[PDB]
Amino acid sequence: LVHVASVEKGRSYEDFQKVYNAIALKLREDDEYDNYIGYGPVLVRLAWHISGTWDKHDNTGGSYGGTYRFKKEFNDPSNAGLQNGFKFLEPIHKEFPWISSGDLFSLGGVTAVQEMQGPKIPWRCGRVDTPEDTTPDNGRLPDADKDAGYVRTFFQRLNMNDREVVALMGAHALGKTHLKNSGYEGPGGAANNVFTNEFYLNLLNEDWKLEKNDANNEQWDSKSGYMMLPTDYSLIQDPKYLSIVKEYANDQDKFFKDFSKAFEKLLENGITFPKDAPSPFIFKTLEEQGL
Ligand code: HEM
Numbered sequence: 466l467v468h469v470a471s472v473e474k475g476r477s478y479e480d481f482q483k484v485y486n487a488i489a490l491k492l493r494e495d496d497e498y499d500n501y502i503g504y505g506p507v508l509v510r511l512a513w514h515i516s517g518t519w520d521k522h523d524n525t526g527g528s529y530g531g532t533y534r535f536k537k538e539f540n541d542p543s544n545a546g547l548q549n550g551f552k553f554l555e556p557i558h559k560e561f562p563w564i565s566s567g568d569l570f571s572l573g574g575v576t577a578v579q580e581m582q583g584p585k586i587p588w589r590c591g592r593v594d595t596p597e598d599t600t601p602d603n604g605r606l607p608d609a610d611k612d613a614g615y616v617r618t619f620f621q622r623l624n625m626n627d628r629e630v631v632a633l634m635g636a637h638a639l640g641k642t643h644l645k646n647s648g649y650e651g652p653g654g655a656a657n658n659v660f661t662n663e664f665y666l667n668l669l670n671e672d673w674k675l676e677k678n679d680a681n682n683e684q685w686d687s688k689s690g691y692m693m694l695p696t697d698y699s700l701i702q703d704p705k706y707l708s709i710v711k712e713y714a715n716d717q718d719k720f721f722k723d724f725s726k727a728f729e730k731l732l733e734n735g736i737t738f739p740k741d742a743p744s745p746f747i748f749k750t751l752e753e754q755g756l
Pocket residue numbers: 506507509510513545546607608609616633634636637639640641642643644645646647648649694696728
């Protein structure tokens with residue numbers, strides 16, 4: 466497979482900035498979802514799940530085809546809880562019917578990170594909706610109950626190296642695990658709808674205890690009321706991952722820079738950009754615009 470980026474006909478930067486502003490205005494507005502966490506965290510989890518199905522060996526999956534819109538992908542056990550993110554973006558797709566699904570789902574993630582005071586993420590347009598039979602089968606997204614070798618081997622399918630994997634995982638400072646969605650429960654820290662390097666500081670500074678939860682799954686729990694998945698806790702059990710965790714805990718700006726590069730890479734895997742294509746857009750936040 467080759468998936469060539471094709472700009473939505475007649476659209477430029479100012480068009481996409483209007484879709485970004487519509488998602489950001491609605492994030493401000495529906496601030497009550499999930500006990501006042503808001504929809505920012507479920508929207509970056511949706512952009513990572515529609516992107517994380519990519520396989521570098523045959524170029525199948527990834528964000529290009531917008532195939533989460535199909536039942537097979539929508540009902541994947543690993544996507545439980547993302548229906549909420551889908552339902553949020555649905556009025557926005559009725560308002561801007563010209564944008565492709567892959568472009569809207571991925572732009573949802575970019576807008577959430579920047580509006581949660583995260584780094585600016587460069588974003589490219591050009592994903593094209595593909596037919597229901599290009600939908601990847603279930604089972605390509607990662608399990609939580611595993612160790613650092615599984616994590617490393619998994620992320621190699623999307624060709625992510627150690628630094629990219631540790632930077633990407635800093636997003637687990639956001640939102641929370643939910644028992645009915647995944648069999649895990651709890652938040653990762655206190656500031657769960659503001660983007661900071663909190664995931665790393667908690668992993669280095671809390672007194673974590675391994676316990677089983679009400680679903681019979683193990684997780685690491687701390688005195689503070691926080692939790693870590695086995696795959697999260699993995700990052701301080703592997704010596705190469707631990708040096709990077711320490712780096713990001715001591716330097717949030719380095720974390721923001723590397724998260725920005727890795728998250729754009731993740732959202733563009735599997736897509737060829739022609740060099741006539743527009744350069745990546747950097748969108749302004751509501752605040753930058755006085756809105
Ligand atoms: C080995 C990698 C990963 C595994 C096993 C994993 C697993 C999980 C699980 C079990 C949940 C909880 C779902 C729920 O109950 O609602 C979760 C939540 C979340 N994940 Fe991941 N994750 C991984 C990587 C990532 C990455 C790379 C990102 C983003 C760059 C990400 C972003 C999120 C976010 C923001 C949430 C919170 C969503 C909410 O509050 O509803 N995850 N993850």
